RNA sequence: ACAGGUUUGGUCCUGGCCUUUCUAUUAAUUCUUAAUAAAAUUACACAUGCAAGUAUCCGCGCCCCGGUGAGAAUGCCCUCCAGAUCUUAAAGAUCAAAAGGAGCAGGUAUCAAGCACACCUAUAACGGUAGCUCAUAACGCCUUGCUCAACCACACCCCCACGGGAAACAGCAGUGAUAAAAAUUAAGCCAUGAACGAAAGUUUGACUAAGUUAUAUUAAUUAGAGUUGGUAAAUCUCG
């Protein structure tokens, strides 16, 4: 997995020179204009297909977030944006893996990207406001009161309840409703 | 959905809603809860109504509106 | 564009760039200009360059032009009140006419800036809609939230049919 | 204060095309329109009938139409307000003198 | 379109990618479809708890109350929402579901200790 | 130009044809509300009455059966509904002004009557039209008891007129007075004064929409 | 007394300390390029253009506000234990109303504990970041602020970038803001890299954190080595403004003061390494007698 | 378009046709599994089961969703709002019919004239003028949903439904006939939305979760199809 090595090798330096990877690679296609996105994968199982990408024709190359020397040559130097596969000629799989790679690269800052000057979020910052500063907690809180009388369950007059049964007499389902106060269970 | 002029199903015709069962505690509790609730919310509503009243008539008839009117008139002249 | 002798004025850029906006009172504008004289010279330019700027920015204001009726060139303005403005343009420079009009029935820069801000406040960051009106859409997108199954398939647990087959058994 | 007309026409100016009706003037209006392909401004014309008390409009007059608050007919929504240039007799708004074309008939002094 | 009647109503439209529901609080006509036309959008609600374990709810309190002051009706889940926030008093049915759930939890404690015995 | 020209004549015809026929087809309430008891079926409407409504229908009679034992129909005799009884201990009585019986050639049991009100002791002095004359929960009081019913009217002071604005809202008002520069620590009071709703048993006045000019 | 960053003295002294480098101020950026625009100008037009440049550069150069830390805000607006038994995960209620200043927004929570709690500061911010998305900000904290990534970015001498990252990502009164800004200052100090942030808008933070850490060493050394006397002058001036009563201040002031006397008396009265100052303050001095 | 092939013995020039890119149906050849979106030949005819109920009466709801694109150059955009409903201490709010018009709006001029398409009297339904539209396309004919956080139109046909043919799935599933065109006669109101309810709540073929299909993307467990003179990647031996 150790990235830096193969980019400084004499084998690599021999093969690719100081030109980027993919320089000499050329993608064969049906006409003057290549299909708008390259092949899905150039590797399925043990089989390497046709004339392989820059990246996967050479197995000793490793796509990571670590090697900046490999990921550099897939990003536009001046524009700092990546190339779409056809510019380069990499396969879709290695191109998605390359985008995701450059991301974690820039998230660990191993790479450069452009960082703009942003002003502060707020214009005038006053911590003073009542949303920020803790309010005068409710007169209802101080007492330990429910915020309203109806949060509290009140056992009703026996008159109202028996007249209520008197209303619904055939359909009444009557089972005691005192609300046990503490929740937890197995 | 169905329409006015679509016929009702046969299996539907003789079937009339059979009411749900009631509990005394639960019920009277709920009637009160809702009574107080709706009371409160109905108060709030009038507060918001008043709010929009204010915003509106203070936007149309506000001293700044007539200020603009007069200022602009004079400017024009 | 190729044809035309000052084709730059058949641009969109040339149209947006002209600055006069009209007050809400202006309805009609009447340009009376003259063909032959040295003292007409400015007025003509105004018709040839600036009239198509003006109009663009005020598509609801009729702008009419008469030739060689009156021996001296002028503008007229018909406001909502029945106020008739009369702007004498004679030895004036084209630029001078423009700026003079801007003075008389203009809009203060602050007015315009205010209005554009009052329209820009109409599209609110926090809403969710189609890409046309809003920015964000499903809240598939926003970071901490749940990824929407198109991109990232969901836990066996959270699927409907998992719950169904679990409640059945 | 309500007197209105739902029509955008509220004030226009047009030529006077024809006199053929009683106390009603046929007036052609012309506005500039931007042809989107060419990006150019051309003269689109539209005719408006208008109403006249005096029946004062000769053909060829440059006339100021004011929108009428309540429409008379399907085809009459306007009232002639003022005659801007009576034809063949034109008095210069600037100097208030009688004129033909480039020439004053009675000059200053 | 033109309707016979109905009221301005504040409710939950459902945008969702299916098994991942999400809602847009919306000021609408009762007689328009759920996901269709509305007057104005008010807030959103995200049911599914996020990375931090939270259910996000945005509301424009100023506008919400601008419409209630115009007499919009609230759907019951918009009232559950407004309840929790404390912009509105807690909804009665909430409390009842509380009592119900507590009673069932007590009954199930007793079932647990009657099965253990 | 946008120009669309087309006559529609039968657009009007049907309008007139229905309207006219409608008033000839206008069902008299005799045949309309008439009920089949062994079924609980409305012959005219084809509707089958609710399940909480069976018993009351079977055991008691509608207002204009017992308004028809009357010598005079304009009796100032107070009428009371069974449900109003069972819900409220304080007397709900409903008294008559103008009665129009619509004549079932058979039992003369239907009609539109117009009363005055007192609901659970709170008195309402103006004549309305009676709503729901149609239902069997109606009962009539004899002349001797009406003196026992009117005197049970009492008066008591109502529950609190003030309230604590809900937690977030109060928070916001407080924040706005503290940011505006009024530091008064006076609690956030709310008036329940105008919040009065009648109990759902209060019969809804049906005439039209009231216009305040 | 009342010294602070936004005082006119501290401001004008920190603007002069910072410096205008139109090459570092306006530098090639990585954005998609456009073809360059050309026009022919007079000497006059080029001068006016130059001043125009300098004016606009100032706005680019404006200092990011420094502020003290915020305290945690813990307040409960209400409690109903009845709700607690619902055992649902946390609810977060934000207000989005376009008129409001984001410190005046109301952000609230209901936990499974059946209580109404106000949002914490970090919480509050990531909320506003959700519904009022502002560029550069991640709603979940970006990895790069771990110590490893920090050191990696320092190695690459990118420090302007880090300090530009925190301005956007966090809030100026936050905890993390302060941790990262200050730790980053420590790095430029131990590496003597001070001239990095020189024409940057970040210079004000350099000056302040150090005057208040009372290590003026590297900046004075560097200033004298860079052949800038006036900056070391206004800097000691600053240590005197943020430390009015001390031996060094009142003595090396009221005795007498100017370039030589105040810089060398504050080189003797600030002892961190006074040997460094005294060395370099000799060298510059010597390099004058050869040049004049 | 970054263009490429193709007129002639050859050379330019002019000038079509075609290739090369992307999407969608349908077909042929192949085909492993998930997940997500989408699902459609047919305003042809329809077996059967369902798609509105609620509710102490009365009332309220009952093409609203949902379906379709048949019709109509329809219409977009912009004025102005009757009415219906909701809230309410009488004025707000949401839909918004009719009626309008700055401007924009399918083809065709081998459709060039249309044939009363105007106004004036406020007299109070009569009289008086002789007009109006139109080559800046009137009046025709032909084809057609759309400018899409939605809007327009239809609801068995006779534009309109009194009346007449005649007995209506262009609701969900299904089915004959037709067409190159093939989803379950499937489970739930558990979430949302809707209707009623004072309320618990009830109903909802909307919708939710499924089921079927390589129709499109994503992931892998899956290997096959087409090509190989040139444009245009790529060939040996036979017949
Ligand atoms: Mg030839
Ligand atoms: Mg040849
Ligand atoms: Mg030849
Ligand atoms: Mg060919
Ligand atoms: Mg197929
Ligand atoms: Mg539809
Ligand atoms: Mg449709
Ligand atoms: Mg068609
Ligand atoms: Mg047609
Ligand atoms: Mg046409
Ligand atoms: Mg309308
Ligand atoms: Mg022909
Ligand atoms: Mg006549
Ligand atoms: Mg029909
Ligand atoms: Mg019929
Ligand atoms: Mg049909
Ligand atoms: Mg079907
Ligand atoms: Mg039907
Ligand atoms: Mg078939
Ligand atoms: Mg198909
Ligand atoms: Mg079903
Ligand atoms: Mg599905
Ligand atoms: Mg596929
Ligand atoms: Mg196989
Ligand atoms: Zn590859
Ligand atoms: Zn999504």
UniProtKB/TrEMBL annotation, chain B:
Transmembrane segments: none annotated. Residues 1-18 are annotated as: Disordered. It is found in: Mitochondrion. Belongs to the mitochondrion-specific ribosomal protein mS26 family. This is Small ribosomal subunit protein mS26. It comes from Sus scrofa (Pig).
From TrEMBL, chain D:
The chain holds residues 2 to 110 of 130 of the full protein. It is found in: Mitochondrion. Belongs to the universal ribosomal protein uS17 family. Keywords: Mitochondrion, Ribonucleoprotein, Ribosomal protein, RNA-binding, rRNA-binding. This is Small ribosomal subunit protein uS17m. Its main location: mitochondrion. It comes from Sus scrofa. GO terms for biological process: translation. GO terms for molecular function: rRNA binding; structural constituent of ribosome. GO terms for cellular component: mitochondrial inner membrane; mitochondrial small ribosomal subunit.
